[PDB]
Symmetry: C2
Amino acid sequence: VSSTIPSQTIPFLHIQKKTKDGWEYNKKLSSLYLDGLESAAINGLTFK
Amino acid sequence: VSSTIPSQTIPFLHIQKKTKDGWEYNKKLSSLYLDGLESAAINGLTFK
């Protein structure tokens, strides 16, 4: 679903990174989080 | 002294404005504050 994130739009759920200006949306971390969410939705998420 | 603020450099003392991204340096408000400080240094500042 990260590839399906549209260009220039910030997803509704997103991981922010810290920079000199402050916290800002990070495409890479948001990609990782959204892919994890997709895997949790399809295969499930384990907490053993 | 505001005119003597160098271009593209943020003064050591400066007023920030609020924007969608957060608090950021504002040339206009920093100009006003620095001019007030210059006047306080030269002529003095009153609190009557």
